[PDB]
Amino acid sequence: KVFGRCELAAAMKRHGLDNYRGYSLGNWVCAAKFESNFNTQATNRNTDGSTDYGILQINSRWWCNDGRTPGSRNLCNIPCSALLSSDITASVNCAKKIVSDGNGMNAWVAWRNRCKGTDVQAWIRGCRL
Ligand SMILES: [Cl-]
Ligand SMILES: [Cl-]
Ligand code: NA
């Protein structure tokens, strides 16, 4: 599924991401925009053989099992394919674990490079939330 910006904002809000670990909702929308272009089916192979999955591009190196990242962990205890669902529950639940992991949203390269230190509230402007 390709979400609209306010559609995804609403879903992220419903799933308790707004201000989760102190990150306002616009942070999560901005991260999703640049990670996946709001596409829940987005996948990207990393140089090390791991793969990032779904709307928040969660990495198989640590967070989910895809059966092809030797040596990796599965800290969200899910198949990576669960992160590609039209329903973002699995992605949000996993994101909450990632953002709790020590480096906060810096875990998301796109967030650090393209969202952090910018007017992220702009991502939720005009949405009925
Ligand atoms: Cl694996
Ligand atoms: Cl933080
Ligand atoms: Na894994």
Curated annotation (Swiss-Prot):
InterPro entries for this protein: Glyco_hydro_22, Glyco_hydro_22_CS, Glyco_hydro_22_lys, Lysozyme-like_dom_sf
A cellular-component GO term for this protein: endoplasmic reticulum
Catalytic activity: Hydrolysis of (1->4)-beta-linkages between N-acetylmuramic acid and N-acetyl-D-glucosamine residues in a peptidoglycan and between N-acetyl-D-glucosamine residues in chitodextrins
Tissue localization of expression: In the egg white and polymorphonuclear leukocytes.
Residue ranges annotated for the C-type lysozyme domain, each copy included: 1-129
Annotated compartments: Secreted
Catalytic residues as annotated in Swiss-Prot or TrEMBL: 35, 52
Keywords, ordered alphabetically: Allergen, Antimicrobial, Bacteriolytic enzyme, Disulfide bond, Glycosidase, Hydrolase, Secreted, Signal
EC number: 3.2.1.17
Pfam families: Lys
GO molecular function term, any single one: beta-N-acetylglucosaminidase activity
Tagged with keyword Cell division: no
Miscellaneous comment as given in the Swiss-Prot or TrEMBL entry: Lysozyme C is capable of both hydrolysis and transglycosylation; it also shows a slight esterase activity. It acts rapidly on both peptide-substituted and unsubstituted peptidoglycan, and slowly on chitin oligosaccharides.
Subunit composition and interactions: Monomer.
Family recorded in the similarity comment: Belongs to the glycosyl hydrolase 22 family.
Protein name as catalogued: Lysozyme C
Organism: Gallus gallus (Chicken)
Gene that specifies this protein: LYZ
